[PDB]
């Protein structure tokens, strides 16, 4: 029982490391996406004015 406990919990720590990496990448491209999201709005306003 000691044996599989010791194996399982370090497996868990590897997998939570993977979760952290993917969450960080998600935060990257979302904070990029909102400024791109209002970039298109500024472009449309320029169009309508012209």
């Amino acid at each position: 029982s000691e044996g599989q406990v010791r194996q399982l919990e370090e497996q868990l720590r590897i997998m939570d490391q993977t979760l952290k990496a993917l969450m960080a990448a998600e935060d990257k491209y979302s904070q990029k996406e909102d400024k791109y999201e209002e970039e298109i709005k500024v472009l449309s306003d320029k169009l309508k004015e012209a």
Binding site: Q17, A21, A24
Partner: protein, 42 residues
């Protein structure tokens, strides 16, 4: 003197922006660190 008594002026915001990223780097990289050890301990 009364509007900005509490803070010093002419400071770049880029320094604060750099430091927040530096602190977030440790969270991303999962660094092991210990606290500062005392001189009297040494």
């Amino acid at each position: 003197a009364v509007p900005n008594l509490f803070v010093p002026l002419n400071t770049n915001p880029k320094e604060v922006q750099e430091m927040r990223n530096k602190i977030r780097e440790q969270n991303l990289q999962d660094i092991k660190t210990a606290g500062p050890q005392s001189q009297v301990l040494c």
